[PDB]
């Protein structure tokens, strides 16, 4: 037996904070967390303890350490079927990654509505506040491969599979309310442009290259989502702290046959929070798995990710009332014009058991709708309906991808489809066609109706000639980017300017930079000038005279477009670094930990080596990581307790930890002699907002620290950070 | 409702004779038949009665008769996800067929040994006469595609999957005791030669072409199996009436580690029985699915195929005691030298539910052995071990083919292998490697032992240089073909001559026919001359003087090599055509059927049209088929009762029916005025052996017919048949 | 050398009647028959005479008769890359057959118009009677597998790939002028009904079974093509002696943008001819490759299949 | 066979030998080479046995494995020399 005597190999099957235990498969970490979908997977879950090691054919293996050979230094024999089986399975482990959103992290959970929606939709999963729908959610980046980093600048995917009693509904959205392009025909052009360039396959996880900015400069329809991507929305703090949007206008259909246009929203109950670019970029090197880790850990802690589903609803007769087209996926519907109605709440409360089996193989597709929903003519949505069925044939090996356990409906499914590679279902129906008399026509079509009815499309009127033509109503490109711009706070606007400036500086062909700046001059001259200045470009007189686009139905701003303008801070689940010394004042630590615990904020104890340090009263303190092994990038705030400060005062890593946290606008709190660190970050004696300081870590010290953490970052420190060499 | 009111759409769920009921899926036909494998497939069985028609996502379909279009004469819309799911699944229904043995028919059953064989093998499925092992058996041809015909001349496959408590054991045999080639390296050559020629892909299901005989003429090692293939062995009457052989010498390993050499045998308990060539050929056109049908129908009738497993056993110290090499797969072990020891019984007692899911997807592989068996150095076996794992990666879509339900072990299987296309099992093991401490090293290796132990190879001595060399001991090609020839009856010899003669007639390049005749001169000059003559070839003086090969260890014949030398007829499950007239004598019919029922022989009632006829006494006789629709090819004998014989006396089809049966040596019985039909087949007034005749269909009229049926065909008739124009 | 002294192994590279010579690959049989498409395949045609036997990696093989083994009666060694490459390629030879029309026989040829059609179509291949368009035609049955018999009673497929100067045009037709069903949504139902039944996979190449007639009895729209299949149309004598049809109304469009409705037809210059049922069925047993053989041999003889 | 889709990965252009390659292997997914050999097997008379095996020799000969002596029992055992 190889496990240590003390059982420390095995994580407690209780919720634990990040770092307290090794992470573990969901069914072993939280065996009592159940929902209908998780239970239905039980047929295929395979354990291991107490079982003999076998081939795939069930033959017990005596010696899994050696190939069969003729003498112990001789050649390997072809009759070694144990070796070849094991090697063959290994040799064929990989499947094709997703064409886009290959990098993503998933969890199980459940959803339920706040109130019946049967007045506007007959969808069963929205019909009853006490009917729970299992869900499986995958969050993702867009451009990079499955082994790329999490904290890149990109759009994020937010895909939700609802295993309803009337079929799978997949709501396949992103973290911004519009897309870069109008018609699915251009998707491969756009994606080829954003992806690594085809000669050398560079760069990974980055829009900062010529082809992407070339396409942008030539396709101003992209400018709206480009603005969102260049803002801090492009670098979320966590999948828990971003919005999700279905982007397209869909339809809701009630039992009376009435259609209402809807756009879908997820509101993060943990609040909206993003990183800053220097931090996000360096975090792709220090921990390329930061978002994956953080989501998995939040769930093991009990800090379940929660989202509120919301609908913008527009009656059918109001289709043409806005000064943008509701079917144009590059246009958003301002919440100032159409409020988001809250619809229900989704809680993600268990991680998967096997990433490959459940995450990699999950197939989400926006064509998977249920009665009570329907599509519209959105020309991007229309082409998506073709892609997500078609792509699984190579990705998942064939047309039986719905039989892969994660994908299976929990409701009944019966039909006359047969065969296909890796067919699991053994059909006993004498008939494989309909109409049939030999099985009395079963399974049977079901008329549409109020509940449990067959699917019928809404009978929308279609009147037009067969054309390949963009609707003229889609031909407006600048007003929504401007509305976005004007709705950001001054610091968010600076971050946008810095995002464009950084990205365009990596574009080798200078005319491409110029052409993008010219597009910026059509949105906002202040933005265009600020970017131009960073690129050493001077706007021409004509560019300076470009008339700014019109307001969006009278709006000069909409604060819901900003991450930060309206506070919605939630510290629960956030994490603080506590920089230890070899003689910690235990009275400081006790007060620190008590206040953090009261607000559900986690701590990591850091030192210049691993092992333990002993505090002033004999308490043995285990060290989670070194200053260098768990950098300030990975925490929300830094606290330094008193004690033997001379131990760490001249440690370069400890000093840098504070300089890096300071530059990235994080709250820092310094107790007792830790106040000596004020010098490294140039804080004046009288102190400064964003640095908490006191003789000791009392209740007052922690309240203030906790208040700053609720506001996420110390924006008012931005003018002070260009001086700092960090 | 589309089913008829009287419920006649639904086959009776009880044993019925062939043709009495429509055929049905095995679990609907025989719900009460069970074994441990059939029980374990229950989780994937899908019903159909009383369920709604859905998409694969569980969405109820309202209209499964139309596409979604813009207006009822308008274009189809891309948003029709119900149409595209359904067409996509249809578009990807097919998977590659097997490289060889693509054509095959399969049934579930069970095996039981007669007694424990623990003194000679530790194999668990042979350890206890009470231990019953589920099986799945697939029988097949070799050459033709999945859509080729059953009653071709070819070798047959007889593949058995034993679902043992210690793993899957696949016994992958043929119906002749040798193979055509010695070393696996030549398999693609031989198989390319026998297969349709690569320019034009002709001929299907036939060795009667130039490239096959070219190869054979250049590779005399193939002559042994060619003799079998050219005999009536190449055209079995039924998969129930052929022998099976593992071909190779394998090893049994007992609990003390002692190795015994073994060759595997299957003895058909329904006896040995073949067609004649003209019958077999025509039958590929009248019913290309005859063996598949016959197998399914035997099982639905309760005429379950039964086979006895037997072992020829040779002590290790006897390896070199014979004139041929035990490892040479072109050599048989005469039963006169090493008898077949009976081991156990196998009964196939349930048809599959879905042919594709269970039969097409089944993967058999002779490397799938269990503790208590091991391989030898037979260099054809040796290369087989590589192929049957390899081929599944394309054929079945990847390395998880063991998770396709029909292939799954019923015993436990646990290991560290992960991922791969269409992965079903969701592993919860924190470790995916060993050795590991984080799961205490589970699943763990198991030392070899008397039972329930790990697989260890037998420590055979290997000594020699790395060579691509054939063993000189394999370089004798004629003595076995000669023993086979001399062991055949004179009519079986005639049929061999005529098999070579017909096949060689289809070889377009005359020099190939001559080179084959030259090879036959090395085996037996009588055989060679008879073939030569049918080809217009004259043997040279040299050829006439070739010394015949030596006998095999003193044997100048072994009658176990003959199909018919030793009668072993069983009539149960055979079929008789009864040719009706419009006024049948009912006393004749009652007597016929009563005698047939007593012996388990089935009957089909034929006429010139469908519907019914009424017998002299008013009895209504249902007609199964017309004379033309169910030709004599498909039955084992023909009886014509009295009645209004004038009604059919001038019917070409009815006359021909008798001529065809007469030509193919089948028993024919004629009662009262049905004796008029003697003219059509030119029978003397005093009658002849093989034609039963009498005033009325009893006393001993049925005993005599039933006695002819036990002898299978009327061999004495052979000189009489060249006369008849049929 | 294994060939016979008198060279009778090699068929003459000149047209010869059926059975006179062994049949051969088309470029060895008729080396001077050329068209643009046939010439464009020259980069991928591989010969054989006078070349050494190699692996796929170009390594010359000394002994293509034996695996590598420890002793001449010993076990086969994993390091035998020659054997494993050869057996790997063999083990993966097959690809999925077509879902329908899996059984079919194909030939190269050419098309030429009788006159310019630019009044009714701007299609480039129809613009000038001197425009020669290479074609590749595959004839087929519908129901049976790639390995089933040719002279079954079935509809026949007649597919022509036109390699035009402005794109490939595939005219994918059958030998009757209608289809069994009205709407593509029902194609998997019709095809499952006609194909071998799912419990036992019987029968091959035949509509003569319960599920086919069940569907037909419940879907009267099928009756028209059913009538054609039940006539001697369902049993052609030869792919050379049957009609072809596109079935659908399509449109021609001319340079002015005017649309004309068109249905396509192929008229066989060898005339129309079919077997009788008893002969056809029996022929599926005596020569299940009869139509494939007869097409190949007509072309080798110079009886070129011609269609208008 | 999975990564590159089948047994014809050698016909993907980067992977192709620049020297001659001829054999009796046929078919497989994505088959590019169109073989004109009347024979797809050896030994064959119908194409005078071409392409032909080549004896090993000093230059341009067939591959033959070094005849290293093998001696021992069939074992799954690590050599003690590796320990
Ligand atoms: C016509 C092509 C096409 C277009 C126009 C879109 N996508 Fe898409 N999307 C795909 C074709 C596709 C795909 C190729 O089918 C993917 C990759 C593999 C897969 O399973 O689906 C995919 C994956 C994918 C995923 C990952 C799902 C998962 O986690 O497995 C998300 C979140 C989105 N997409 C979201 C969007 C949004 C919000 C779009 C515009 C509003 C959008 N896609 C446009
Ligand atoms: C080295 C390659 C090789 C050689 C020398 C053999 N075979 Fe084989 N055999 C295969 C390679 C193979 C295969 C390519 O792996 C097949 C085709 C598809 C499959 O799953 O296995 C196969 C299938 C196959 C089947 C069909 C199993 C089923 O019904 O699915 C049978 C009965 C046999 N073989 C029997 C034999 C016997 C008795 C042989 C000589 C003693 C033999 N094979 C030599
Ligand atoms: C909705 C599906 C569907 C429908 C309604 C049809 N087919 Fe089809 N057809 C196919 C789906 C298909 C296919 C599944 O896509 C095939 C099978 C394999 C392939 O490559 O294409 C095919 C093959 C195929 C072939 C063989 C081409 C070849 O030789 O490779 C012919 C001649 C036709 N079809 C002709 C027709 C005609 C004349 C139809 C009715 C007017 C028809 N098909 C309806």
PDB file of N, CA, C and O and ligand atoms in Angstrom, chain B residues 87 90-91, chain C residues 97-101 104 138-141 156-159 172-174 176 178-179 181 183-185 187-188 245-248, ligand 3:
ATOM      1  N   UNK B  87     -32.102  14.161 -41.043  1.00  0.00           N
ATOM      2  CA  UNK B  87     -31.298  13.833 -42.287  1.00  0.00           C
ATOM      3  C   UNK B  87     -29.811  13.606 -41.962  1.00  0.00           C
ATOM      4  O   UNK B  87     -29.207  12.734 -42.545  1.00  0.00           O
ATOM      5  N   UNK B  90     -29.423  10.020 -40.632  1.00  0.00           N
ATOM      6  CA  UNK B  90     -29.487   9.161 -41.827  1.00  0.00           C
ATOM      7  C   UNK B  90     -28.191   9.207 -42.691  1.00  0.00           C
ATOM      8  O   UNK B  90     -27.606   8.177 -42.996  1.00  0.00           O
ATOM      9  N   UNK B  91     -27.696  10.421 -42.959  1.00  0.00           N
ATOM     10  CA  UNK B  91     -26.483  10.649 -43.772  1.00  0.00           C
ATOM     11  C   UNK B  91     -25.226   9.970 -43.221  1.00  0.00           C
ATOM     12  O   UNK B  91     -24.240   9.859 -43.936  1.00  0.00           O
TER      13      UNK B  91
ATOM     14  N   UNK C  97     -19.828   2.603 -46.825  1.00  0.00           N
ATOM     15  CA  UNK C  97     -20.461   2.656 -48.176  1.00  0.00           C
ATOM     16  C   UNK C  97     -21.468   3.797 -48.228  1.00  0.00           C
ATOM     17  O   UNK C  97     -21.853   4.350 -47.192  1.00  0.00           O
ATOM     18  N   UNK C  98     -21.940   4.122 -49.414  1.00  0.00           N
ATOM     19  CA  UNK C  98     -22.970   5.167 -49.542  1.00  0.00           C
ATOM     20  C   UNK C  98     -24.232   4.687 -48.800  1.00  0.00           C
ATOM     21  O   UNK C  98     -24.578   3.470 -48.847  1.00  0.00           O
ATOM     22  N   UNK C  99     -24.950   5.615 -48.187  1.00  0.00           N
ATOM     23  CA  UNK C  99     -26.163   5.234 -47.391  1.00  0.00           C
ATOM     24  C   UNK C  99     -27.145   4.564 -48.353  1.00  0.00           C
ATOM     25  O   UNK C  99     -27.815   3.613 -47.978  1.00  0.00           O
ATOM     26  N   UNK C 100     -27.265   5.113 -49.554  1.00  0.00           N
ATOM     27  CA  UNK C 100     -28.121   4.531 -50.616  1.00  0.00           C
ATOM     28  C   UNK C 100     -27.288   4.561 -51.860  1.00  0.00           C
ATOM     29  O   UNK C 100     -26.269   5.290 -51.915  1.00  0.00           O
ATOM     30  N   UNK C 101     -27.655   3.710 -52.821  1.00  0.00           N
ATOM     31  CA  UNK C 101     -26.899   3.598 -54.071  1.00  0.00           C
ATOM     32  C   UNK C 101     -25.467   3.087 -53.775  1.00  0.00           C
ATOM     33  O   UNK C 101     -24.512   3.400 -54.536  1.00  0.00           O
ATOM     34  N   UNK C 104     -22.660   0.255 -57.352  1.00  0.00           N
ATOM     35  CA  UNK C 104     -22.663   1.024 -58.617  1.00  0.00           C
ATOM     36  C   UNK C 104     -21.389   0.839 -59.400  1.00  0.00           C
ATOM     37  O   UNK C 104     -20.399   0.442 -58.830  1.00  0.00           O
ATOM     38  N   UNK C 138     -21.622   7.332 -62.817  1.00  0.00           N
ATOM     39  CA  UNK C 138     -21.719   6.137 -61.965  1.00  0.00           C
ATOM     40  C   UNK C 138     -23.159   5.747 -62.061  1.00  0.00           C
ATOM     41  O   UNK C 138     -24.024   6.624 -61.893  1.00  0.00           O
ATOM     42  N   UNK C 139     -23.403   4.516 -62.490  1.00  0.00           N
ATOM     43  CA  UNK C 139     -24.736   3.956 -62.468  1.00  0.00           C
ATOM     44  C   UNK C 139     -24.864   3.128 -61.219  1.00  0.00           C
ATOM     45  O   UNK C 139     -23.882   2.549 -60.797  1.00  0.00           O
ATOM     46  N   UNK C 140     -26.063   2.919 -60.715  1.00  0.00           N
ATOM     47  CA  UNK C 140     -26.160   2.163 -59.450  1.00  0.00           C
ATOM     48  C   UNK C 140     -27.551   1.524 -59.262  1.00  0.00           C
ATOM     49  O   UNK C 140     -28.513   1.971 -59.899  1.00  0.00           O
ATOM     50  N   UNK C 141     -27.710   0.590 -58.352  1.00  0.00           N
ATOM     51  CA  UNK C 141     -29.074   0.292 -57.762  1.00  0.00           C
ATOM     52  C   UNK C 141     -29.310   1.221 -56.567  1.00  0.00           C
ATOM     53  O   UNK C 141     -28.575   2.175 -56.393  1.00  0.00           O
ATOM     54  N   UNK C 156     -32.738   2.429 -60.643  1.00  0.00           N
ATOM     55  CA  UNK C 156     -31.306   2.608 -60.870  1.00  0.00           C
ATOM     56  C   UNK C 156     -30.975   4.090 -60.778  1.00  0.00           C
ATOM     57  O   UNK C 156     -31.772   4.941 -61.212  1.00  0.00           O
ATOM     58  N   UNK C 157     -29.794   4.378 -60.229  1.00  0.00           N
ATOM     59  CA  UNK C 157     -29.225   5.762 -60.162  1.00  0.00           C
ATOM     60  C   UNK C 157     -28.436   5.943 -61.461  1.00  0.00           C
ATOM     61  O   UNK C 157     -27.933   4.971 -62.009  1.00  0.00           O
ATOM     62  N   UNK C 158     -28.289   7.192 -61.899  1.00  0.00           N
ATOM     63  CA  UNK C 158     -27.564   7.572 -63.114  1.00  0.00           C
ATOM     64  C   UNK C 158     -27.035   8.989 -62.753  1.00  0.00           C
ATOM     65  O   UNK C 158     -27.725   9.986 -62.914  1.00  0.00           O
ATOM     66  N   UNK C 159     -25.786   9.027 -62.295  1.00  0.00           N
ATOM     67  CA  UNK C 159     -25.125  10.237 -61.839  1.00  0.00           C
ATOM     68  C   UNK C 159     -23.999  10.609 -62.786  1.00  0.00           C
ATOM     69  O   UNK C 159     -23.160   9.739 -63.135  1.00  0.00           O
ATOM     70  N   UNK C 172     -27.576  14.357 -60.895  1.00  0.00           N
ATOM     71  CA  UNK C 172     -27.728  13.171 -60.067  1.00  0.00           C
ATOM     72  C   UNK C 172     -29.147  12.653 -60.215  1.00  0.00           C
ATOM     73  O   UNK C 172     -30.092  13.101 -59.558  1.00  0.00           O
ATOM     74  N   UNK C 173     -29.297  11.721 -61.140  1.00  0.00           N
ATOM     75  CA  UNK C 173     -30.636  11.261 -61.566  1.00  0.00           C
ATOM     76  C   UNK C 173     -30.873   9.779 -61.311  1.00  0.00           C
ATOM     77  O   UNK C 173     -30.002   9.087 -60.789  1.00  0.00           O
ATOM     78  N   UNK C 174     -32.046   9.312 -61.722  1.00  0.00           N
ATOM     79  CA  UNK C 174     -32.442   7.904 -61.669  1.00  0.00           C
ATOM     80  C   UNK C 174     -32.971   7.464 -63.031  1.00  0.00           C
ATOM     81  O   UNK C 174     -33.089   8.281 -63.920  1.00  0.00           O
ATOM     82  N   UNK C 176     -36.015   6.402 -63.741  1.00  0.00           N
ATOM     83  CA  UNK C 176     -37.477   6.661 -63.903  1.00  0.00           C
ATOM     84  C   UNK C 176     -37.653   8.154 -63.667  1.00  0.00           C
ATOM     85  O   UNK C 176     -36.800   8.795 -62.996  1.00  0.00           O
ATOM     86  N   UNK C 178     -39.764  10.002 -61.891  1.00  0.00           N
ATOM     87  CA  UNK C 178     -40.342  10.538 -60.664  1.00  0.00           C
ATOM     88  C   UNK C 178     -39.665   9.888 -59.515  1.00  0.00           C
ATOM     89  O   UNK C 178     -38.990   8.883 -59.679  1.00  0.00           O
ATOM     90  N   UNK C 179     -39.902  10.390 -58.325  1.00  0.00           N
ATOM     91  CA  UNK C 179     -39.447   9.659 -57.160  1.00  0.00           C
ATOM     92  C   UNK C 179     -40.633   9.100 -56.350  1.00  0.00           C
ATOM     93  O   UNK C 179     -41.804   9.386 -56.667  1.00  0.00           O
ATOM     94  N   UNK C 181     -41.377   9.727 -53.197  1.00  0.00           N
ATOM     95  CA  UNK C 181     -41.892  10.582 -52.129  1.00  0.00           C
ATOM     96  C   UNK C 181     -41.820  12.039 -52.513  1.00  0.00           C
ATOM     97  O   UNK C 181     -41.000  12.414 -53.354  1.00  0.00           O
ATOM     98  N   UNK C 183     -41.469  14.854 -50.097  1.00  0.00           N
ATOM     99  CA  UNK C 183     -40.740  15.851 -49.282  1.00  0.00           C
ATOM    100  C   UNK C 183     -39.531  15.106 -48.688  1.00  0.00           C
ATOM    101  O   UNK C 183     -39.690  14.032 -48.171  1.00  0.00           O
ATOM    102  N   UNK C 184     -38.351  15.710 -48.786  1.00  0.00           N
ATOM    103  CA  UNK C 184     -37.102  15.167 -48.249  1.00  0.00           C
ATOM    104  C   UNK C 184     -37.233  14.779 -46.777  1.00  0.00           C
ATOM    105  O   UNK C 184     -36.522  13.867 -46.380  1.00  0.00           O
ATOM    106  N   UNK C 185     -38.112  15.446 -45.990  1.00  0.00           N
ATOM    107  CA  UNK C 185     -38.234  15.055 -44.568  1.00  0.00           C
ATOM    108  C   UNK C 185     -38.568  13.549 -44.465  1.00  0.00           C
ATOM    109  O   UNK C 185     -38.202  12.890 -43.494  1.00  0.00           O
ATOM    110  N   UNK C 187     -37.468  11.102 -46.399  1.00  0.00           N
ATOM    111  CA  UNK C 187     -36.542  10.177 -47.079  1.00  0.00           C
ATOM    112  C   UNK C 187     -36.005   9.081 -46.120  1.00  0.00           C
ATOM    113  O   UNK C 187     -36.020   7.930 -46.475  1.00  0.00           O
ATOM    114  N   UNK C 188     -35.573   9.442 -44.882  1.00  0.00           N
ATOM    115  CA  UNK C 188     -35.148   8.345 -43.948  1.00  0.00           C
ATOM    116  C   UNK C 188     -36.263   7.327 -43.682  1.00  0.00           C
ATOM    117  O   UNK C 188     -35.978   6.113 -43.554  1.00  0.00           O
ATOM    118  N   UNK C 245     -33.132  10.374 -65.818  1.00  0.00           N
ATOM    119  CA  UNK C 245     -33.976  11.550 -65.583  1.00  0.00           C
ATOM    120  C   UNK C 245     -33.406  12.304 -64.375  1.00  0.00           C
ATOM    121  O   UNK C 245     -33.020  11.654 -63.394  1.00  0.00           O
ATOM    122  N   UNK C 246     -33.450  13.622 -64.406  1.00  0.00           N
ATOM    123  CA  UNK C 246     -33.132  14.405 -63.207  1.00  0.00           C
ATOM    124  C   UNK C 246     -34.277  14.455 -62.169  1.00  0.00           C
ATOM    125  O   UNK C 246     -34.076  14.868 -61.009  1.00  0.00           O
ATOM    126  N   UNK C 247     -35.466  14.069 -62.629  1.00  0.00           N
ATOM    127  CA  UNK C 247     -36.710  14.085 -61.852  1.00  0.00           C
ATOM    128  C   UNK C 247     -37.230  15.497 -61.532  1.00  0.00           C
ATOM    129  O   UNK C 247     -38.318  15.856 -61.955  1.00  0.00           O
ATOM    130  N   UNK C 248     -36.458  16.316 -60.796  1.00  0.00           N
ATOM    131  CA  UNK C 248     -36.905  17.634 -60.423  1.00  0.00           C
ATOM    132  C   UNK C 248     -37.006  18.577 -61.604  1.00  0.00           C
ATOM    133  O   UNK C 248     -36.236  18.458 -62.576  1.00  0.00           O
TER     134      UNK C 248
HETATM  135  C1  LIG E   3     -32.740  13.872 -48.224  1.00  0.00           C
HETATM  136  C2  LIG E   3     -31.891  12.930 -48.651  1.00  0.00           C
HETATM  137  C3  LIG E   3     -31.935  12.455 -50.028  1.00  0.00           C
HETATM  138  C4  LIG E   3     -33.075  12.463 -50.919  1.00  0.00           C
HETATM  139  C5  LIG E   3     -34.481  13.000 -50.736  1.00  0.00           C
HETATM  140  C6  LIG E   3     -32.489  11.836 -52.105  1.00  0.00           C
HETATM  141  N1  LIG E   3     -31.218  11.413 -51.984  1.00  0.00           N
HETATM  142 FE1  LIG E   3     -29.992  10.664 -53.485  1.00  0.00          FE
HETATM  143  N2  LIG E   3     -28.582  10.407 -52.157  1.00  0.00           N
HETATM  144  C7  LIG E   3     -28.529  10.870 -50.876  1.00  0.00           C
HETATM  145  C8  LIG E   3     -29.483  11.552 -50.235  1.00  0.00           C
HETATM  146  C9  LIG E   3     -30.828  11.811 -50.757  1.00  0.00           C
HETATM  147  C10 LIG E   3     -27.183  10.715 -50.171  1.00  0.00           C
HETATM  148  C11 LIG E   3     -27.331  10.153 -48.737  1.00  0.00           C
HETATM  149  O1  LIG E   3     -26.496  11.955 -49.921  1.00  0.00           O
HETATM  150  C12 LIG E   3     -26.351   9.957 -51.158  1.00  0.00           C
HETATM  151  C13 LIG E   3     -25.833   8.675 -50.539  1.00  0.00           C
HETATM  152  C14 LIG E   3     -24.328   8.674 -50.599  1.00  0.00           C
HETATM  153  C15 LIG E   3     -23.848   9.931 -51.288  1.00  0.00           C
HETATM  154  O2  LIG E   3     -22.648  10.275 -51.520  1.00  0.00           O
HETATM  155  O3  LIG E   3     -25.036  10.642 -51.561  1.00  0.00           O
HETATM  156  C16 LIG E   3     -27.358   9.765 -52.306  1.00  0.00           C
HETATM  157  C17 LIG E   3     -26.911   9.087 -53.408  1.00  0.00           C
HETATM  158  C18 LIG E   3     -27.576   9.113 -54.696  1.00  0.00           C
HETATM  159  C19 LIG E   3     -27.008   8.540 -55.931  1.00  0.00           C
HETATM  160  C20 LIG E   3     -25.708   7.796 -56.173  1.00  0.00           C
HETATM  161  C21 LIG E   3     -24.658   8.853 -56.616  1.00  0.00           C
HETATM  162  C22 LIG E   3     -23.402   8.019 -56.764  1.00  0.00           C
HETATM  163  O4  LIG E   3     -23.441   7.161 -57.658  1.00  0.00           O
HETATM  164  O5  LIG E   3     -22.471   8.151 -55.965  1.00  0.00           O
HETATM  165  C23 LIG E   3     -28.048   8.825 -56.938  1.00  0.00           C
HETATM  166  C24 LIG E   3     -28.065   8.475 -58.414  1.00  0.00           C
HETATM  167  C25 LIG E   3     -29.085   9.563 -56.160  1.00  0.00           C
HETATM  168  N3  LIG E   3     -28.805   9.672 -54.860  1.00  0.00           N
HETATM  169  C26 LIG E   3     -30.308  10.089 -56.810  1.00  0.00           C
HETATM  170  C27 LIG E   3     -31.484  10.655 -56.208  1.00  0.00           C
HETATM  171  C28 LIG E   3     -32.681  11.022 -56.986  1.00  0.00           C
HETATM  172  C29 LIG E   3     -32.961  10.907 -58.459  1.00  0.00           C
HETATM  173  C30 LIG E   3     -33.544  11.457 -55.913  1.00  0.00           C
HETATM  174  C31 LIG E   3     -34.935  11.915 -56.020  1.00  0.00           C
HETATM  175  C32 LIG E   3     -35.357  12.675 -56.991  1.00  0.00           C
HETATM  176  C33 LIG E   3     -32.763  11.328 -54.693  1.00  0.00           C
HETATM  177  N4  LIG E   3     -31.527  10.893 -54.912  1.00  0.00           N
HETATM  178  C34 LIG E   3     -33.284  11.674 -53.324  1.00  0.00           C
END
